[PDB]
Design a protein around this ligand. Structure first.
Ligand SMILES: Nc1nc2c(ncn2[C@@H]2O[C@H](COP(=O)(O)OP(=O)(O)OP(=O)(O)O)[C@@H](O)[C@H]2O)c(=O)[nH]1
Ligand SMILES: Nc1nc2c(ncn2[C@@H]2O[C@H](COP(=O)(O)OP(=O)(O)OP(=O)(O)O)[C@@H](O)[C@H]2O)c(=O)[nH]1
Ligand SMILES: [Mg+2]
Ligand SMILES: [Mg+2]
Lengths: 141, 141
């Protein structure tokens, strides 16, 4: 069957609410069998420092986060996109607005103007599949 | 604020579960105030016979259904697309798979190959915003 490659930008893991739940805790692959929009097995990073050339996990994926309070994390976006574009392609199937149930955010929705490149998720309520089912882009790429 | 124009293909109305609920019953405009992915007011047809040049409600919309058991309704898709493309545009922001909790379907997921044009919804369970929030396409058109 169709087997989907998913490789997700300090609440990414969080998302992966696979295990239906809500989790201070190197690498996790995960495998579930859904149906999306009509038999689909799904196939989680840590963006801390150390991995940089282990990252080039950008090679084996099809579809590819910030915290709405963390502007430097908004600002980490631009370092990222570059090493998956340089999957020598200027268009990869690919923006995660996590931590949206919170009450003092430094990255304004407005500013996530995404549209230059080509969702606001709460891993704490479940406002987690609306971002992932990215599978739909895989499905037209 | 941003005011979104929405004009939806015998379970369309159904969808519009606006009123949070689940409904044998000419035209309904509807107005709700959400947030999608970061202040968004939302702005329902009957595809029976009579309206055809009243339809040309294709002029005042930005974003624009079948029943998974109804192949002739799958087959009504192609009549439709044409009069909103002829909004003299070959690319309009715009496929609804309704009646997906049921158990004998004549339109196979597989065949909704959508991808030529450019979701499977249950208005009976709530498997209703995943199709609509179409608003995201409006937002990059
Ligand atoms: N309130 C709130 N906290 C969250 C949410 N998602 C994650 N967190 C918290 O933020 C912290 C980090 O969550 P993790 O899932 O470990 O984050 P990380 O993104 O994995 O860090 P890297 O793996 O290096 O990218 C934890 O204490 C989480 O509970 C969310 O949506 N709401
Ligand atoms: N089981 C089931 N029946 C549904 C669903 N959605 C609609 N129906 C039923 O199908 C029938 C038609 O629903 P309506 O919402 O009136 O359908 P319609 O699409 O409005 O007809 P037009 O307005 O001419 O396009 C009703 O008896 C609904 O309850 C659904 O997802 N599940
Ligand atoms: Mg993580
Ligand atoms: Mg209807």
């Amino acid at each position: 069957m169709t087997e989907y490659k998913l490789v997700v930008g300090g609440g990414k893991s969080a998302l992966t609410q696979i295990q239906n739940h809500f989790v201070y805790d190197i690498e996790d692959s995960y495998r579930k069998q859904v149906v999306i929009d009509g038999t689909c097995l799904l196939d989680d990073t840590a963006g801390q420092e150390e991995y940089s050339a282990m990252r080039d996990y950008m090679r084996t994926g099809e579809g590819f986060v910030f915290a709405i309070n963390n502007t430097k994390s908004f600002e980490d976006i631009h370092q990222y996109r570059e090493q998956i574009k340089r999957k020598d392609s200027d268009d990869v199937p690919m923006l995660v607005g996590n931590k949206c149930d919170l009450a003092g955010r430094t990255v304004e929705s407005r500013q996530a103007d995404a549209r230059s490149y080509g969702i606001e998720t709460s891993a704490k309520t479940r406002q987690v599949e609306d971002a992932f089912y990215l599978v739909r882009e895989i499905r037209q790429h």
